[PDB]
C-alpha cells in the first residue's frame, strides 16, 4: 500500500474505519457523522505517516499541525487529541528517537518492571518518556531475555530469536531505522538430504511438500466442515488429526485396490462362464459332425427322409458353428478387457517408508515453527494468528539480534543479577522482593505504585513457584497459565575456520531416520558473515537432547555434515555453543503455543491486569496494580519479538492512562 493509506497498513490499522481501541477514546467521533469520522481517520493516517517517514526524531504535536493541510488543521483540539492517542499507545514516538522536548525535571508515579526482555524494555522506555519513574529488575547479567546473541572474536550467532518475519506492518521496521541492524534476506530454497547423506531428488521434494501442504489443508477440513474437535471427551490435537487424515488416505488406497481386482474377478468369472458354454458347444458340435458324417455315408439314391437327415444335420451344424463363433468374438472382447485392467493397476502405497521420512521433515518444520510436538497443538486454534502475518521476505540479523535490546536499554534504570522472588500488591501500592543471583542472602525491597510483570510464561508455570504472588493470582489467571502451552526449541552453533557449504544457500535440511527423531538436528542455517552454521533441534527431540552433553551433540552434528559434504571437507569446529532453554530457569522454554484445550482467548486473559481488594472493608474499589506484558500476552502476535515489543507498548499506554490520566477523551 501507498500514501496515508500505507501508514495505516504499516501500523496494523484499517485505513478506512476506526478500531475498537479508538472508538473508546473517541466515542464522540464514532457515534457521530461519517464526515467527521473521515476527518479523524485522515488525521490519524497522516500523523502516522509523518512519524513513519522519519522515525529518528520525536514527532511533536506542533510539527504535526504545521504540516497538516486545511481543512484538516481547522479543528486544533481534534488534532491534539489524535496525536496524544497515538503517542500514548506507542503508534508514534516509540523506540529510540531523539526527543525534541527533553524530559520533565521531576517524575510522576513509580513503576517496577520485572524482566528486561524486549517487552520489558519497550514498556520501560515508554513509561520513562511519559514522565514516570521506572526501574527494571532482571535476573540475568544481560538485557534481552530470549533475545540472546553469542559473541566471541568475530563469531556472532543468535541463540534466541534469529529472524524478522517481514516488514509489512512490522514494528521492527521502525526499529531497524532507529538501530543499526544489518538485515539480510532469507532465500526460501532448502535442499533436503536423507540420512545416508545424498540429496533428495527434485521429483520427490516437490511431491512430498505438496502432500504435506495437502495434509494440512485436510485437517482444516476436519476441524471446520466436519467439527472433529473433541475425541473421547478430550480436545483434538493437530497431530491426532494428521494421523487420522493419513490413515484415511492409506485406507482409500486399499479401498481402491480392492475394487480394482474385484473388477478383475467379476469378468474372469464372466470369462469362465463363457468358456463353459464353449466346451459344451464344441462337444455338441463334435457329436453332431459325427452324425452328419454317418448320415452322409448312406450313399444315394436316398429316400426323402434320409435326404432330410443330411440337410437337417447340416443346417443344425452350421447353426451351432455360428454360436461358437459369436462366442469367440465375445471371448476376445474379454481377453482384452482383462489385460487392459491388468495393465493399469492403481497406486500400491499412499507413501513409502522413504516418503513418510521426508514427510517427517516437513513435520519437523511445523514442530519448529510452533516450538512443540504437533500432538500438543490445538487443532482448532493452532494457526489463529495466521491472519495477521506481515508481508515481505523473512530476514535475519547479521550483527546479532541483541543489538536491539542493548539499544533500548540505553538510559534506563536496570538492576541486573536481581531475581524477583515475591510480588506483593495491595490497595495502596506494591512491594517487590528480590535477591542477588550471585549471593542469594542479599535481599532487596522495591516499593512502587504498579508492577509490570514480563516473566516468561514458562516461569509463571513453574511448580513449585519461582515467584510468589501476595495475594495469589486469581483462578481465572492461573487456569489460563495452566491451559496455555509453553514450548521448547534449541540451537547448536558451529564455528568453523572455513566455509565448506554452499554459501548461496541460507538453509538446508537433514532428513531423520525415524519419526521419533524427526526434529534431531533437522535443519542448518548459514546466516552470518563468519563461517558459522546453525543447527536446530525441534519437536520431541528438543526436550530429549537437553540431557545429552555438548560434545555428543556437536558430534552427531559433525557426522551429518560429513555425510552431506564428505569426511574430508568438515573440520573440527573452533567454538561450539548448545542452548538448553527448557533448562534455563529464567525462561523454562522458548515461546508459547496454542495448546490443545486452549485458544487465543487465553492470551487475552494473560494480558488482563490484576486489581487487589480493599485494605479497609467498605473502602471504595481500587486501581489495578499488577500488569502483564510479554509474548504470551498478545493474541494477534504471540511468540515473536515484535509481539513482545507491542505488548510492552500496550501496557505502557495502559499504565499511563491509569496513573497519569487520559486527557484525550473529552
Amino acid at each position: 500500500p501507498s500514501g496515508v493509506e500505507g501508514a495505516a497498513f504499516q501500523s496494523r490499522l484499517p485505513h478506512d474505519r476506526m478500531t475498537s481501541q479508538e472508538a473508546a477514546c473517541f466515542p464522540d467521533i464514532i457515534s457521530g457523522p461519517q464526515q467527521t469520522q473521515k476527518v479523524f481517520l485522515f488525521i490519524r493516517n497522516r500523523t502516522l505517516q509523518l512519524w513513519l517517514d522519519n522515525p529518528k526524531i520525536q514527532l511533536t504535536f506542533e510539527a504535526t499541525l504545521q504540516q497538516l493541510e486545511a481543512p484538516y488543521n481547522s479543528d486544533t483540539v481534534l488534532v491534539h487529541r489524535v496525536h496524544s492517542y497515538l503517542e500514548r499507545h506507542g503508534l508514534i514516538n516509540f523506540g529510540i528517537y531523539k526527543r525534541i522536548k527533553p524530559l520533565p525535571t521531576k517524575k510522576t508515579g513509580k513503576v517496577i518492571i520485572i524482566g528486561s526482555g524486549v517487552s520489558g524494555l519497550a514498556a520501560a522506555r515508554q513509561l520513562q518518556s511519559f514522565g514516570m519513574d521506572v526501574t527494571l529488575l532482571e535476573a540475568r547479567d544481560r538485557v534481552g531475555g530470549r533475545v540472546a546473541t553469542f559473541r566471541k572474536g568475530n563469531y556472532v550467532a543468535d541463540l534466541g530469536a534469529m529472524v524478522v518475519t517481514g516488514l509489512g506492518g512490522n514494528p521492527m521496521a521502525v526499529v531497524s531505522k532507529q538501530v543499526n541492524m544489518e538485515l539480510a534476506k532469507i532465500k526460501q530454497k532448502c535442499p533436503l538430504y536423507e540420512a545416508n547423506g545424498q540429496a533428495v531428488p527434485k521429483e520427490k521434494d516437490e511431491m512430498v511438500e505438496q502432500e504435506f501442504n495437502r495434509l494440512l489443508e485436510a485437517t482444516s477440513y476436519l476441524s471446520h466442515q466436519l467439527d472433529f474437535n473433541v475425541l473421547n471427551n478430550k480436545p483434538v490435537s493437530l497431530g491426532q488429526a494428521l494421523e487420522v487424515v493419513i490413515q484415511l488416505q492409506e485406507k482409500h488406497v486399499k479401498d481402491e485396490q480392492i475394487e480394482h481386482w474385484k473388477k478383475i474377478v467379476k469378468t474372469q468369472e464372466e470369462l469362465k462362464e463363457l468358456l463353459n458354454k464353449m466346451v459344451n458347444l464344441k462337444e455338441k458340435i463334435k457329436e453332431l459332425h459325427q452324425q452328419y458324417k454317418e448320415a452322409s455315408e448312406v450313399k444315394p439314391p436316398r429316400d426323402i427322409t434320409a435326404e432330410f437327415l443330411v440337410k437337417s444335420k447340416h443346417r443344425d451344424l452350421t447353426a451351432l458353428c455360428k454360436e461358437y463363433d459369436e462366442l469367440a468374438e465375445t471371448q476376445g472382447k474379454l481377453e482384452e478387457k482383462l489385460q487392459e485392467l491388468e495393465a493399469n493397476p492403481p497406486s500400491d502405497v499412499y507413501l513409502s517408508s522413504r516418503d513418510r521420512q521426508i514427510l517427517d521433515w516437513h513435520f519437523a518444520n511445523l514442530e519448529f515453527a510452533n516450538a512443540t510436538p504437533l500432538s500438543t497443538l490445538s487443532l482448532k486454534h493452532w494457526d489463529q494468528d495466521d491472519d495477521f502475518e506481515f508481508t515481505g521476505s523473512h530476514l535475519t540479523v547479521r550483527n546479532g539480534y541483541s543489538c536491539v535490546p542493548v539499544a533500548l536499554a540505553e538510559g534506563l534504570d536496570i538492576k541486573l543479577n536481581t531475581a524477583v522472588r515475591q510480588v506483593r500488591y495491595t490497595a495502596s501500592g506494591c512491594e517487590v522482593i528480590a535477591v542477588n543471583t550471585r549471593s542469594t542472602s542479599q535481599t532487596f525491597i522495591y516499593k512502587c505504585d504498579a508492577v509490570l510483570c514480563t516473566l516468561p510464561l514458562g516461569v509463571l508455570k513453574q511448580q513449585p513457584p519461582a515467584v510468589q504472588f501476595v495475594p495469589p493470582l486469581p483462578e481465572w489467571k492461573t487456569s489460563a497459565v495452566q491451559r496455555m502451552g509453553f514450548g521448547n526449541l534449541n540451537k547448536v552453533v558451529l564455528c568453523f575456520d572455513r566455509v565448506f557449504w554452499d554459501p548461496s544457500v541460507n538453509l538446508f535440511g537433514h532428513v531423520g531416520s525415524t519419526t521419533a527423531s524427526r526434529g534431531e538436528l533437522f535443519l542448518f542455517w548459514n546466516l552470518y558473515k563468519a563461517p558459522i552454521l546453525l543447527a536446530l533441534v525441534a519437536g520431541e527431540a528438543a526436550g530429549i537432547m537437553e540431557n545429552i552433553s555438548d560434545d555428543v551433540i556437536v558430534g552427531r552434528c559433525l557426522a551429518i555434515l560429513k555425510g552431506i559434504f564428505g569426511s574430508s571437507a568438515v573440520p573440527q569446529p573452533k567454538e561450539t555453543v548448545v542452548s538448553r532453554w527448557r533448562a534455563d530457569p529464567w525462561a523454562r522454554g522458548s515461546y508459547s503455543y496454542v495448546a490443545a484445550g486452549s485458544s487465543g482467548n487465553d492470551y487475552d486473559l494473560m494480558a488482563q491486569p490484576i486489581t487487589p481488594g480493599p485494605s479497609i472493608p467498605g473502602a471504595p474499589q481500587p486501581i489495578p496494580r499488577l500488569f502483564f506484558a510479554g509474548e504470551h500476552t498478545i493474541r494477534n502476535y504471540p511468540a515473536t519479538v515484535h509481539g513482545a515489543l507491542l505488548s510492552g507498548l500496550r501496557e505502557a499506554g495502559r499504565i499511563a492512562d491509569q496513573f497519569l490520566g487520559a486527557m484525550y477523551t473529552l
Partner: protein, 133 residues
C-alpha cells in the same frame, strides 16, 4: 467447503478410525486381508480358465462344413415339398431354418408355402405334432 482434491475424508469413515485406539490398524488390516483373499481368488479362476482353454485347442475348425452358395428359386419341386413338410415337423415355425434346409427357397415363400399347401399337407396337424414335442 470441500476437502482438497485427492483427499478422502467422509464423516462415516472418520468415526470408524476413531472408535477405539487400534480401530485404525484393524480397519486397515481387514482390507489388507480382504485383498489377499481376492488376489488368490483370481489365481484360482485364472487357473480354472487355463484348463478350459486347453480343452478348446483346435477350436471347431475340423467340424466346419463348406458353405452352400446356392441361387434361390420359386418353383417347388416334389422333393423340396417333402423336405419342407419334414422341416415343419422338426422346426415348428422357424422359417429361417426351414429355408436353410431346402436350400433354394428363401424365407418368404417358405412363409407363403404354409398357406398355399395348408390343407393338402395337413400343415396344421404337422404343427400340432411338433407342438407336443
Amino acid at each position: 467447503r470441500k476437502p482438497p482434491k485427492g483427499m478422502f475424508l467422509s464423516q462415516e469413515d472418520v468415526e470408524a478410525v476413531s472408535a477405539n485406539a487400534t480401530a485404525a490398524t484393524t480397519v486397515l488390516r481387514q482390507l489388507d486381508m480382504e485383498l489377499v483373499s481376492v488376489k488368490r481368488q483370481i489365481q484360482n479362476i485364472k487357473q480354472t480358465n487355463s484348463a478350459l482353454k486347453e480343452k478348446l485347442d483346435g477350436g471347431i475348425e475340423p467340424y466346419r462344413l463348406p458353405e452352400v452358395i446356392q441361387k434361390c428359386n420359386a418353383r417347388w419341386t416334389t422333393e423340396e415339398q417333402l423336405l419342407a413338410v419334414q422341416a415343419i415337423r422338426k422346426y415348428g415355425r422357424d422359417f429361417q431354418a426351414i429355408s436353410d434346409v431346402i436350400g433354394n427357397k428363401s424365407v418368404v415363400q417358405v412363409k407363403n408355402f404354409f398357406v398355399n399347401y395348408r390343407r393338402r399337407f395337413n400343415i396344421d396337424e404337422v404343427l400340432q405334432e411338433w407342438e407336443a414335442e
